[PDB]
Amino acid sequence: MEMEKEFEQIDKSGSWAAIYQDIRHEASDFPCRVAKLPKNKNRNRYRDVSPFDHSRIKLHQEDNDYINASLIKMEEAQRSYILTQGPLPNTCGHFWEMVWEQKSRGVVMLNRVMEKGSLKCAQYWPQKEEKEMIFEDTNLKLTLISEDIKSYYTVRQLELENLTTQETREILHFHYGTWPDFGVPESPASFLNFLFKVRESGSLSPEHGPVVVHCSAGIGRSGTFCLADTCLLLMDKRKDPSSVDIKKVLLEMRKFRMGLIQTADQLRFSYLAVIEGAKFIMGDSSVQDQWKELSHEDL
């Protein structure tokens, strides 16, 4: 309601850039001293994207507990997310160690391994059933069990095994294939179709650890995904769309990780996705079938 009136106003006055820059100016600034230690330079994909000390995920290793990953703990919405960079060749074991220790059930990947001619993410999961991966540094084994390939995204079932204890867990991998770096999804429908696939899996349940969300830096596409989900959840808990202030929610999220949402068009898209998703939240169940058709997932 109030967010739709605000959307129309911003969009008629052509002021998304100024709205977005105001968010950047008001965003929190907290120290990232661990991320900037010399021994961690090769654990960071981007010099200017670091986790805050207060919200960084710590590995349960005695040597070096550092990974470029942040816990976004949304107190009012009662949902947590782990946002992280795309793993590097030397941090793939750390990534799966974090998944194990945090008891996550789902991993949401919003990028491709190669984008714009460069390698934006290591190949951190196995592409063939018969070629499992072993992470010797963290003593974990990862096997591809099956995969469901749709036209613009893929859902994989992985088996993660702690080789120390021989315990195994099913991890779901939700891989969005058509969301360009620094860009927006092709439509609200295709974004929402994917988001509700993650939701329906149970991966966002409070019974599990936080879902792990990443793109290449873990702030732009990842921030858009989490902002839309949190806004929809807030509206759902209250059953009241007009009670949600997207910009306040984004500023709250930015207390836990810098730079969430990287462009004014990604902010604008977040409004579009939440406004459209509100139709489902407020009881028009049939719109989910509409998104599935408009997303052309079965092509």
Residue numbers in the entry: 1 to 299
Any passages from the paper?
Structures were obtained of the PTP1B T177G and YopH G352T ligand-free enzymes and in complex with vanadate. In both ligand-free structures, the WPD-loops are observed in the closed position. This is in contrast to the typical observation of this loop in the open, noncatalytic position in crystal structures of these and other PTPs lacking a bound oxyanion. In contrast, we do not observe any electron density for the open state in the crystal structure of PTP1B T177G. For the PTP1B variant, crystal structures do not provide a clear rationale for how the T177G mutation might affect loop equilibrium. In the mutant PTP1B structure, most of the interactions that stabilize the closed conformation remain intact; however, the polar interaction between the side chain of T177 and the backbone of Y152 is lost. In addition to the loss of this interaction between T177 and Y152, no other obvious changes in the X-ray crystal structures indicate alterations of the WPD-loop equilibria. This is consistent with the observation that the T177 side chain is part of a network of noncovalent interactions that are likely responsible for stabilizing the open conformation of the WPD-loop, and therefore substitutions at position 177 would be expected to disrupt this interaction network, causing a population shift toward a closed conformation of the loop. The basic limb of the profile and the maximal turnover number are unaltered, while the acidic limb is shifted somewhat to higher pH, with the net result that the T177G variant below pH 6 is a slower enzyme than native PTP1B. The T177G mutation in PTP1B raises the kinetic pKa1 by 0.36 units, whereas the orthogonal G352T mutation in YopH results in a full unit decrease.
